[PDB]
Every structure is written in structure tokens, then in C-alpha cells.
């Protein structure tokens, strides 16, 4: 329940885990609030250990959200292509991993991906460096127990800070 808003250049929020607690989970839940303008955004990034491509992708595509995730070798998509979300107004997407089945919120449109038959490192807000980068407003965000907004504001030594940010 804390906001962050990101200017011109695009902001950035890095959570790191120590090298000595990255958490391999069987279960993810990520849950942001946010609003924005622009149609083609990176919202949440989580990174695996170093060189495992990405673990936990939310990007705006298209105007609607998307999560990307991998169980290994393959990555699983999750589209919520009902729900429009590049109208400025406030937005709350909730993505619950479970093993290889997967929910995805938003808003109030559920969307259920069931499976046919990896260590953490970071999470990152934003994108500073993928033109045109995040713009717009970020609010309590919610990740594996983590309200990484929250410890921005606190300024967790975890929390590293870059680019062009306010709270409000």
C-alpha cells in the first residue's frame, strides 16, 4: 500500500536475495497494483541464478497483461486478453504459481493455465534499459511474502535503487 511513481527514462526497484538465501520455491504468488498510459511495458522481473534466463516475466503487451514463467527448459505463457489496462486508472494483476499449474488475476478476470501431465536471485520493478522503458505508477507489490515497494521505503540494504523515482 505504497506507491512509486516512475518518470521520464524509466525507473528501476531491485530486491536481491544474499547469495546464501536464494529461495527455491515450489510456489510463487505475485501480486501488483498499478496504472499506466503506455500500451508495451515491463512490470515485475524475477531472475534465476546466473545465466537461467528469467524466472517470472509480467509484461503489457498489446494493452492487456501477460506472465511468462518456466518449469525448466520450457517457459509457460499466461494471457489475460479480456482485461484493458492501458487507460491510466488503477489496475491489480495476482499471478499464483502452484508446481506447473498457474492462476492469473486481473482485475476481476481469472484466468486458470493447468499443466499437461530453479533458485531465485533477484526482483526487479520496472525496466530502465528496454525503450520505450516503464512509465507510469507502481503500488504494493507483493511477491513470495515480499512487499518489495514497502522496503524500497524503508531502504532495505537489499532494495537497490535506480533511475527516476518518487514516493507518493
Known amino acids: 500500500a505504497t506507491t512509486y511513481i516512475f518518470g521520464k527514462g524509466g525507473a528501476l526497484i531491485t530486491y536481491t536475495w544474499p547469495p546464501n538465501d536464494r529461495?527455491?520455491?515450489?510456489?510463487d504468488?505475485?501480486?501488483?497494483g498499478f496504472s499506466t498510459h503506455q500500451r508495451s511495458a515491463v512490470l515485475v522481473r524475477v531472475d534465476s541464478a546466473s545465466g537461467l534466463g528469467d524466472y517470472?516475466?509480467?509484461h503489457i503487451?498489446?494493452?492487456?497483461?501477460?506472465?511468462?514463467?518456466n518449469v525448466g527448459t520450457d517457459d509457460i505463457t499466461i494471457d489475460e486478453p479480456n482485461a484493458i489496462v492501458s487507460d491510466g486508472k488503477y489496475h491489480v494483476v495476482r499471478f499464483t504459481r502452484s508446481g506447473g499449474n498457474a492462476t492469473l488475476?486481473?482485475?476481476?478476470w481469472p484466468v486458470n493455465e493447468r499443466y499437461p501431465a530453479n533458485s531465485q536471485a533477484?526482483?526487479?520493478?520496472?525496466?530502465?534499459?528496454?525503450?520505450?522503458?516503464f512509465q507510469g505508477q507502481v503500488s504494493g507489490l507483493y511477491?513470495?511474502?515480499?512487499?518489495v515497494l514497502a522496503l524500497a521505503a524503508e531502504s532495505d540494504p537489499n532494495v537497490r535503487t535506480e533511475g527516476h523515482l518518487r514516493l507518493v
Open 143 to 147: 511477491y513470495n511474502g515480499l512487499k
Open 56 to 58: 517470472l516475466q509480467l
Open 122 to 133: 533477484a526482483i526487479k520493478i520496472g525496466g530502465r534499459d528496454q525503450g520505450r522503458p
Open 23 to 27: 529461495p527455491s520455491t515450489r510456489m
Open 29 to 32: 504468488r505475485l501480486a501488483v
Open 61 to 69: 503487451d498489446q494493452g492487456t497483461v501477460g506472465v511468462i514463467f
Open 105 to 108: 488475476q486481473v482485475d476481476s
